[PDB]
Amino acid sequence: GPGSMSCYNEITTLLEFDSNDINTTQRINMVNNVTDSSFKNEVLESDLPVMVDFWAEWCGPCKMLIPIIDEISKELQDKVKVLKMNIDENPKTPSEYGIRSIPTIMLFKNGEQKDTKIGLQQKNSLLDWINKSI
C-alpha cells in the first residue's frame, strides 16, 4: 500500500535566564522559608524559641495562614521566631520529623522540640499554643 513516511522536524531551543547563586551571613530574624542545612544551622543555634511551620501549597487554606502569620510574626518576632519550611523544598524534612500532615506548627527552643500541632490555627490559637510551649 502507500508508504507511510513522515520525516520529523526540529527547532533550536534557546535559554531564557543566566545562572547565579550568592549567599552571605545575614540574620534570618524574619518570617521566611529556610533550607534543610540552614534550618538546623540557624534554628538549632537559636537560643530563643523558634516556631517552624512545615507547609505546602496543596493544603488549601494556606492563603489564610499567610496573612495570619504575616500579622502575628511581627508580634512574636521579639520572643518567638516564626520560620517556614516547605515539604516540597525539603523532602527529607517530613520523613525526619514524621510530618504526615500540614500546615503544620512545630515548636523549637534552643533547637529542642517543645510541642507540635497539626491543622489550620488562627492568630489567637497560634499565640496561645506557642506561649504554652515556650
Curated annotation (Swiss-Prot):
One of its GO terms (cellular component) is cytoplasm. GO terms for molecular function: protein-disulfide reductase activity. The keyword ATP-binding does not apply. Keywords: Disulfide bond, Electron transport, Redox-active center, Transport. It comes from the Bacteria. Gene3D superfamilies: Glutaredoxin (3.40.30.10). PROSITE patterns: THIOREDOXIN_1, THIOREDOXIN_2. This is Thioredoxin. It comes from Rickettsia prowazekii (strain Madrid E).
